[PDB]
Design an enzyme around this catalytic site. Structure first.
Site, PDB file in Angstrom:
ATOM      1  N   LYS A   1       0.913  -1.096   0.028  1.00 26.06           N
ATOM      2  CA  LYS A   1      -0.060  -0.010  -0.031  1.00 26.06           C
ATOM      3  C   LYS A   1       0.831   0.926  -0.197  1.00 26.06           C
ATOM      4  CE  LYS A   1      -4.657   0.913   2.018  1.00 26.06           C
ATOM      5  NZ  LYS A   1      -5.646   0.930   3.377  1.00 26.06           N
ATOM      6  N   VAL A   2       0.785   2.161  -1.416  1.00 28.21           N
ATOM      7  CA  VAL A   2       2.069   3.124  -1.569  1.00 28.21           C
ATOM      8  C   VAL A   2       1.399   4.104  -1.269  1.00 28.21           C
ATOM      9  CG1 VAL A   2       3.601   4.225  -2.162  1.00 28.21           C
ATOM     10  CG2 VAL A   2       3.132   1.306  -2.277  1.00 28.21           C
TER      11      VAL A   2
ATOM     12  N   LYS B   1       5.427   3.903   2.083  1.00 27.18           N
ATOM     13  CA  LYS B   1       4.490   2.030   1.682  1.00 27.18           C
ATOM     14  C   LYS B   1       3.904   1.160   2.669  1.00 27.18           C
ATOM     15  CE  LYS B   1       5.382  -2.372  -0.327  1.00 27.18           C
ATOM     16  NZ  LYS B   1       4.948  -2.050  -2.093  1.00 27.18           N
TER      17      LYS B   1
ATOM     18  N   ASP C   1      18.728  -6.178  -6.642  1.00 22.03           N
ATOM     19  CA  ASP C   1      17.783  -5.822  -8.205  1.00 22.03           C
ATOM     20  C   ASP C   1      17.501  -4.291  -8.747  1.00 22.03           C
ATOM     21  OD1 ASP C   1      15.324  -6.379  -9.582  1.00 22.03           O
ATOM     22  OD2 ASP C   1      13.929  -5.007  -8.181  1.00 22.03           O
TER      23      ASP C   1
HETATM   24  O1  K8K Z   1      13.218   1.857  -1.083  1.00 22.58           O
HETATM   25  C1  K8K Z   1      13.603   2.358   0.280  1.00 22.58           C
HETATM   26  N1  K8K Z   1      12.873   2.655   1.331  1.00 22.58           N
HETATM   27  C2  K8K Z   1      11.358   1.645   0.116  1.00 22.58           C
HETATM   28  C3  K8K Z   1      10.831   0.619   0.488  1.00 22.58           C
HETATM   29  C4  K8K Z   1       9.321   0.442   0.135  1.00 22.58           C
HETATM   30  C5  K8K Z   1       8.578   1.847  -0.493  1.00 22.58           C
HETATM   31  C6  K8K Z   1       8.268   1.210  -2.065  1.00 22.58           C
HETATM   32  C7  K8K Z   1       7.172   2.789  -2.674  1.00 22.58           C
HETATM   33  F1  K8K Z   1       6.961   2.009  -3.330  1.00 22.58           F
HETATM   34  C8  K8K Z   1       6.958   3.574  -1.851  1.00 22.58           C
HETATM   35  C9  K8K Z   1       7.699   3.687  -0.352  1.00 22.58           C
HETATM   36  F2  K8K Z   1       7.704   5.162   0.215  1.00 22.58           F
HETATM   37  C10 K8K Z   1       8.598   2.394  -0.134  1.00 22.58           C
HETATM   38  N2  K8K Z   1       8.912   3.151   1.101  1.00 22.58           N
HETATM   39  C11 K8K Z   1      10.584   2.510   1.004  1.00 22.58           C
HETATM   40  O2  K8K Z   1      10.603   3.215   2.380  1.00 22.58           O
HETATM   41  C12 K8K Z   1      14.397   2.436   0.685  1.00 22.58           C
HETATM   42  N3  K8K Z   1      15.706   1.851  -0.283  1.00 22.58           N
HETATM   43  C13 K8K Z   1      17.582   2.344   0.617  1.00 22.58           C
HETATM   44  C14 K8K Z   1      18.541   1.930   0.393  1.00 22.58           C
HETATM   45  C15 K8K Z   1      18.547   1.349  -0.415  1.00 22.58           C
HETATM   46  C16 K8K Z   1      19.133   0.324   0.280  1.00 22.58           C
HETATM   47  C17 K8K Z   1      19.651  -1.215  -0.275  1.00 22.58           C
HETATM   48  C18 K8K Z   1      19.521  -1.133  -1.332  1.00 22.58           C
HETATM   49  C19 K8K Z   1      19.177  -0.718  -2.353  1.00 22.58           C
HETATM   50  C20 K8K Z   1      19.215   1.124  -2.158  1.00 22.58           C
HETATM   51  N4  K8K Z   1      17.037   3.048   1.899  1.00 22.58           N
HETATM   52  N5  K8K Z   1      15.192   3.133   1.742  1.00 22.58           N
END
Ligand code: K8K
Length: 266
Positions: free
Chosen positions: A13-14, A28, A121
């Site tokens: 859920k975004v 999310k 990925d």
């Molecule tokens: O992508 C990240 N975090 C999303 C996950 C899930 C999500 C999906 C959405 F569609 C929208 C969102 F808002 C969320 N929220 C998050 O916090 C995130 N990457 C990193 C750094 C890092 C680490 C290792 C490999 C590469 C990059 N830190 N946070």
């Protein structure tokens, strides 16, 4: 450190949500329904260690909503969507911003590999853009958020590109990803930047495509209409080599790309 944010702080859920003090954020909410406090110790620990990754080209996990049967991951807003979105968009992104996006991806990936993180990925959906056209590397699929990822996929909740994947991973899910698994991905992201579309047409990712790739097939270079500097074509071919030990390291890529960007593209 990370914030242990409350749902209350966000004014209706975004989904998008406004923090009272901090400002604009994306979120999310992965979990809903029953309570599972048995994982609640780990989920916080995974989050505070993912938050340890602090680089200008790496997405910052701003906080976590950890409540009774409701779990969310909140990060900073990247105004211009993802990389593919920016490339397909009406306004043609210039060769000078393209080369900078390429330098920034190299900067971000080298940092992660530095910190021991293997993306696994990498793809344009995971490369986000701000208003100033600057990028950040993200893990939207939680490939690196090991705990949170299965929580997201579990049965107690009420709610995939092979194009960038190294041939050693196709048809072999038990192979452990390496730093070079990210390097193959990058080379196809190089092609995507210059061709402004997805590789291998748009379909299918079936046993035919997969076998053609594992044998040695790579994206069509001759499908890049736009001007592409000789040096960056050498690079994508170098990075998408069938043997991982042939592919360069990101700090190695950085060493040869930074002088090139400076003289020829900046
Ligand atoms: O992508 C990240 N975090 C999303 C996950 C899930 C999500 C999906 C959405 F569609 C929208 C969102 F808002 C969320 N929220 C998050 O916090 C995130 N990457 C990193 C750094 C890092 C680490 C290792 C490999 C590469 C990059 N830190 N946070």
């Amino acid at each position: 450190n990370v914030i242990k944010m409350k749902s209350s702080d966000f004014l209706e859920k975004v989904s998008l949500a406004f923090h009272r003090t901090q400002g604009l954020m994306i979120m999310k909410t992965v979990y809903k329904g029953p309570n599972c406090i048995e994982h609640n110790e780990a989920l916080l620990e995974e989050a505070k260690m993912m938050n340890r990754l602090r680089h200008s080209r790496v997405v910052k996990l701003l906080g976590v909503i950890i409540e009774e049967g409701k779990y969310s991951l909140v990060m900073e807003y990247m105004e211009k969507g993802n990389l593919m979105h920016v490339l397909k968009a009406e306004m043609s992104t210039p060769l000078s911003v393209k080369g900078r996006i390429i330098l920034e991806i190299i900067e971000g990936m080298a940092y992660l590999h530095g910190k021991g993180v293997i993306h696994k990925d990498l793809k344009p959906e995971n490369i986000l853009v701000d208003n100033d056209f600057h990028i950040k590397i993200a893990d939207l699929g939680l490939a690196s958020f090991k705990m949170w990822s299965k929580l997201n996929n579990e049965e107690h909740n009420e709610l995939g590109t092979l194009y960038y994947m190294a041939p050693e991973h196709l048809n072999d899910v038990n192979a452990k990803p390496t730093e070079k698994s990210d390097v193959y991905s990058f080379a196809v992201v190089l092609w995507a930047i210059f061709a402004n579309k997805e590789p291998y047409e748009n379909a299918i990712a079936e046993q035919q495509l997969i076998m053609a790739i594992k044998s040695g097939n790579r994206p069509d270079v001759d499908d890049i209409t736009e001007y592409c500097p000789r040096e960056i074509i050498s690079l994508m071919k170098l990075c998408w080599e069938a043997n991982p030990e042939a592919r360069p390291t990101f700090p190695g890529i950085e060493e040869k790309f930074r002088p090139f960007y400076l003289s020829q593209l900046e």
